């Protein structure tokens, strides 16, 4: 019978819903202060409250819209859909939750919107020349990824202001390169030339039409150009039903936020579009550079992926900027830029290899926990993402939507979207904590029999000065009677120490450093476990000593994050794929790996005993990766057969193994083939 809300929610219809999901409370005098109150739905139900007066809301998980996920990107008419649920209805009760899932597919043939944003500094004059064959060739290779690709073009030359520009010391730098027997263009900040078009042959011509300018300050204006290309949808030509690839091509270090101080540029960058009718950034002389923060939010919010087509000697800065600009990718550009075709095709494939979700406009009282299905039916907790996917593959995320306490009676929209995808899941969230009979109440002084009090949920409720079992014993003094069940098992405390029994309910006289809740003064707001001198380290609230964690925290001490970037490796894999994540850290895997992400494994067998497993399946149809149907995504290495394992003279590991057929196979494992892993497997293994 008497379970939790028996002492914690009896004083208030809202409180009994706030206290536990199992509680119900009858009305219309079904049980007119009969004896039990609140308890469990089932106890009141049996004790004459079976009729729907019980005011027992439940939580719900419903889907409002589920347009089916699409197989092919060119499958227009009905909008090509990248995710399964579209609109979700979520109904919560306090301290409760519901599960849902997000199916995301790397839809095959999905259209590509690519913009080529070029460095127009003088060192690139030969680049503009080489690029005369691109657009046509780029799109041609991309025809394999998708049948529909559009190509645009723009450029940057840095802010046309005193310290960046050659200052126009004389007139001679108004139209520069007078210095070296040639001519070149003035500085312009950021320019837009060609919007994205399907007529990609226009790019070939538009790039031939361009020529370079002069920069005194080596750092590039590339960050204003990226941000404007990212933000100015209306001119860039980005269509929402397409991937947006912003290609940034450059031979130099970029200039960043507040460096602009040198030119008297102190205006904050609001991340807005400032490109006018002349297809020119008019803010180039007044606004500062965008920050890594602004770039990240705008490219994430608007689904733009950045590709850094950067020459080799500056890659260290671009790679480090991408770490601080999540979702972007950085490759290595040839000095003649002939490899932008390949750089982009691989960059696209890399972008599409990751599925990552981000939740927009998530309120403070709700916690969204994720378990991501990265392979087969195995899910890894604490993940917003999965690595190692191919185009046409799916990822399945399991989400738990939990609410702390009782947030305000407003409907909120939680947008759950893959990053880079237009499609998203809108979860419409409401909180059912209000007993209908809370509202259908007219206290009116009288009505609490003969007295002055309130009334709710079918029974009277006299407040302070009137109290009593119904309406009696205003200020104790009539108190020395009635006994009552003031404590479990009648152990005879007056009231669990901090309080005193008063006419059927206890009154807590304490009013120091917090609050006391419940009929028996049961709940001590201030009594819980400390983590580091503070109850649950300040990362949750307490209710009767039970800490209710805040967003992204778990555990009795609210000391464990649900955050994994602190345990994530440089290769994008949690625990480098060999270890388990716990409390923001990493648990050591049996072979002896160690460090925050299991980086080092000195007593670990050489790679040859781990790489043979890939060959054994991708080429020979044997091994764990065969049985587990995993090799195809696990091994992303290139494996080729050769007639001879030659004296390469480079970093090639000589690997060997005896197979099921009593044959000996040798192969070489070669590192860094322009960043790729290459295996050379002998065509003719030895055998008896």
């Amino acid at each position: 019978g008497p379970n939790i809300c028996t002492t914690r929610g009896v004083s208030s219809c809202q409180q009994c819903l706030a206290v536990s999901p199992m509680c119900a409370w009858c009305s219309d005098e079904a049980l007119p202060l009969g004896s039990p109150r609140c308890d469990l739905k089932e106890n009141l139900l049996k004790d004459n409250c079976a009729p729907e007066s019980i005011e027992f809301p439940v939580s719900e998980a419903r889907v409002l819209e589920d347009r089916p996920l699409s197989d092919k990107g060119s499958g227009d008419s009905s909008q090509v859909t990248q995710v399964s649920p579209q609109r979700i209805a979520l109904r919560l009760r306090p301290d409760d939750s519901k599960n849902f899932s997000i199916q995301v597919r790397q839809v095959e043939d999905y259209p590509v919107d690519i913009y080529y944003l070029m460095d127009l500094s003088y060192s690139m004059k030969d680049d503009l020349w080489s690029i005369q064959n691109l657009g046509t060739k780029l799109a041609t290779q991309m025809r394999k990824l998708t049948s529909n690709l559009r190509i645009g073009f723009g450029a940057f030359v840095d802010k046309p202001v005193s310290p960046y520009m050659y200052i126009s010391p004389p007139e001679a730098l108004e139209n520069p390169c007078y210095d070296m027997k040639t001519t070149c263009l003035p500085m312009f900040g950021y320019k837009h030339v060609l919007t994205l078009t399907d007529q990609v042959t226009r790019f070939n011509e538009e790039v031939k039409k361009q020529s370079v300018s002069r920069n005194r300050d080596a750092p590039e204006g590339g960050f204003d150009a990226i941000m404007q290309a990212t933000v100015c949808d209306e001119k860039i030509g980005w269509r929402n039903d397409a991937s947006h690839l912003l290609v940034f091509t450059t031979d130099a270090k970029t200039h960043i936020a507040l460096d602009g101080r040198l030119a008297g540029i102190v205006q904050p960058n609001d991340g807005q579009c400032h490109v006018g009718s002349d297809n020119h950034y008019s803010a180039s002389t007044t606004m500062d550079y965008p920050s890594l923060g602004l770039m990240t939010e705008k490219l994430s919010q608007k689904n733009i992926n950045l590709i850094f087509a950067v020459t080799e000697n500056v890659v260290n800065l671009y790679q480090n900027y991408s770490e601080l600009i999540p979702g972007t990718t950085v490759g290595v550009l040839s000095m003649d830029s002939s490899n932008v075709l390949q750089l982009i095709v691989d960059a696209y494939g890399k972008i599409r290899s990751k599925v990552e979700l981000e939740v927009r406009d998530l309120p403070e009282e709700l916690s969204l926990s994720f378990n991501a299905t990265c392979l087969n039916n195995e899910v890894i907790p604490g993940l917003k993402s999965c690595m190692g996917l191919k185009i046409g593959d799916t990822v399945s995320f399991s989400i738990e939507a939990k609410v702390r306490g009782c947030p305000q009676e407003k409907e909120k929209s939680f947008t759950i979207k893959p990053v880079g995808f237009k499609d998203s899941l809108i979860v419409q969230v409401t909180f059912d904590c209000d007993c209908a009979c809370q509202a259908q109440a007219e206290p009116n002084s009288h009505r609490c029999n003969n007295g002055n009090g309130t009334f709710e949920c079918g029974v009277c409720r006299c407040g302070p000065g009137w109290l009593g079992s119904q309406c009696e014993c205003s200020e104790e003094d009539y108190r020395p009677s009635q006994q009552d069940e003031c404590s479990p098992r009648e152990g005879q405390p007056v009231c669990s120490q901090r309080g005193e029994c008063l006419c059927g309910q206890c009154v807590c006289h304490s009013s120091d450093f917090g609050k006391i809740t419940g009929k028996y003064c049961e709940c001590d707001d201030f009594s819980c476990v400390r983590y580091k001198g503070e109850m649950c380290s300040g990362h949750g609230q307490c209710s009767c000593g039970d800490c209710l964690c805040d967003s992204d925290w778990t555990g009795y001490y609210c000391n464990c994050t649900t955050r994994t970037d602190t345990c994530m490796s440089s290769n994008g894999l949690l625990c480098s794929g060999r270890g388990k994540c716990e409390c923001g850290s990493c648990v050591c895997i049996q072979p002896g790996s160690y460090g925050d992400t299991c980086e080092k494994c000195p007593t670990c067998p050489d790679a040859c005993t781990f790489k043979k497993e890939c060959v054994e399946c991708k080429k020979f149809d044997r091994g764990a990766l065969h049985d587990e149907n995993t090799c195809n995504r696990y091994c992303r290495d290139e494996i080729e057969s050769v007639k001879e394992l030659k004296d390469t003279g480079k970093d090639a590991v000589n690997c060997t193994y005896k197979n099921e057929d009593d044959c000996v196979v040798r192969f070489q494992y070669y590192e860094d083939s322009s960043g790729k892993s290459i295996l050379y497997v002998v065509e003719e293994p030895e055998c008896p």
Partner: antibody, heavy 117, light 107 residues
């Protein structure tokens, strides 16, 4: 104070060749671009050729190119103009000049070149 | 590029003010200079880069203009202002000069 002195002008038979010199002192010769400007009998000024401060870049009037060479010796503080395949149109007072970012800030006194049979 | 310079000749009584005009066929930003040439003497920079005067050149000489149209004004012409004037363009190869204006003093 900047001092520019050109020499080597004179009467040259058409189709001939002639070398002009221009000595310089009073300034860091190798820190500035040098030009030759000629004044044609109509009193019109015409830029002829430019040599960069380090001598790396050399620009010529299109109707001069392939016949004239502008060069300098930064150690000898002397500017040169070697003319060849001379026509009557090349008759003029030749002035060497020092640049100030596109302007000819300082000028020589002039060396007269007569092209005639 | 063609630099048109007018007027070709000018007769100015001392104390009177004059101006010369330079026209370029295309835009030359501010890459226009002015020179003076007195008898049996070489040309001298007067104004560089359309309005920047030089160091021992009188304030009476003031250049102005941008792109395609430039002026050189001389307030209160003095006897010693006699002689030829030339504009020169330093925008695009080859460098070009205007035809030149012959300034004469009225007496």
């Amino acid at each position: 104070e900047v001092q520019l002195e050109e020499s080597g002008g004179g009467l040259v038979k058409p189709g001939g060749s002639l070398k002009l010199s221009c000595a310089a002192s009073g300034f860091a010769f190798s820190s500035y671009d040098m030009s030759w400007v000629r004044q044609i009998p109509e009193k019109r000024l015409e830029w002829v050729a430019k040599v960069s401060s380090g001598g790396g870049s050399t620009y010529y009037l299109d109707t001069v190119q392939g016949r004239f060479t502008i060069s300098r010796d930064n150690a000898k503080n002397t500017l040169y103009l070697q003319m060849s395949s001379l026509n009557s149109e090349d008759t003029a007072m030749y002035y060497c000049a020092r640049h100030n970012y596109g302007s000819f800030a300082y000028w020589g006194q002039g060396t007269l070149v007569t092209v005639s049979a | 590029l063609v630099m048109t310079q007018t007027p070709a000749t000018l007769s100015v009584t001392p104390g009177d003010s004059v101006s010369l005009s330079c026209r370029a066929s295309q835009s030359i930003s501010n890459h226009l200079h002015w020179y003076q040439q007195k008898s049996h003497e070489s040309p001298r920079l007067l104004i560089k880069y359309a309005s920047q005067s030089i160091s021992g050149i009188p304030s009476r000489f003031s250049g102005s203009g941008s792109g395609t149209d430039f002026t050189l004004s001389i307030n209160s012409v003095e006897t010693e202002d006699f002689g030829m004037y030339f504009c020169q363009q330093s925008n695009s190869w080859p460098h070009t000069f205007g035809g030149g204006t012959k300034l004469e003093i009225k007496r």
